[PDB]
Write an enzyme that holds these catalytic residues in place. Structure first.
Site: not given
Ligand SMILES: NCCCC[C@H](N)C(=O)NS(=O)(=O)OC[C@H]1O[C@@H](n2cnc3c(N)ncnc32)[C@H](O)[C@@H]1O
Lengths: 114, 115
Positions: B33, B95, B101
């Site tokens: 995003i 993070q 991920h």
């Protein structure tokens, strides 16, 4: 093998490196041009030139590089965290065409990651 | 629940929207995003693992699968000039979501150091 790169020479023990860990299928050693207080590489002994040519059969080996990387990071005292990086090709800034996982820590890593 | 409590679990269970590139029984790839490159996507396991520092030895194939899926998606998205894969761990790693991920960034020259 180990390949026709400087990393092949390191694997074959033909040139020196500060080795952190070794097993039958990979090698971890400090990077010669460190970008953080701790900066090392984990590489497969199998010559895979770049991540883009790895195959499904390599999945466990590639995951092994990350598990070895996180274990080495812990052993080197990186308890505040770190960053793992794989570079592919020109845009990725890949410097040696032998797959390698960078692990960097000992300072705040910033965003974007290059 | 399947996928865990983080926002990434919500994405896995399709409770919040995402722009999904690839999905299988083990993982999911979707666009970030807040892209930091012209192409910037994430590959995440469907099994919740909070961060790479707590991954188990038995997670090796799964972690490797994230990288294989990352490189396959990069090729499918036309990143023929290359890309950078990144895993962030903890505070120094920057993070912000505690579900492991893999970032894949491309479409521009990436610089050194990588942050
Ligand atoms: C930011 C911080 N530097 C960071 O990289 N944190 S991260 O945990 O390593 O990465 C999480 C990424 O997930 C992205 N993110 C967060 N929420 C969403 C949603 N809802 N969709 C897609 N992507 C998301 C976010 O932009 C981050 O790039």
């Amino acid at each position: 093998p180990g390949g026709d790169t400087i990393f092949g020479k390191i694997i074959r023990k033909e040139i020196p490196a500060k080795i952190i860990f070794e097993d039958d299928r990979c090698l971890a050693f400090h990077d010669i041009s460190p970008q953080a207080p701790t900066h090392f590489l984990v590489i497969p002994k199998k010559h895979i030139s770049q991540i883009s040519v790895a195959e499904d059969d390599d999945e466990s080996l590639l995951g092994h590089l990350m598990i070895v990387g996180k274990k080495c990071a812990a052993d080197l005292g990186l308890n505040k965290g770190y960053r793992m990086v794989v570079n592919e090709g020109s845009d990725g800034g890949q410097s040696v065409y032998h797959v390698h996982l960078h692990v960097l820590g000992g300072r705040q890593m910033h965003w974007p990651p290059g």
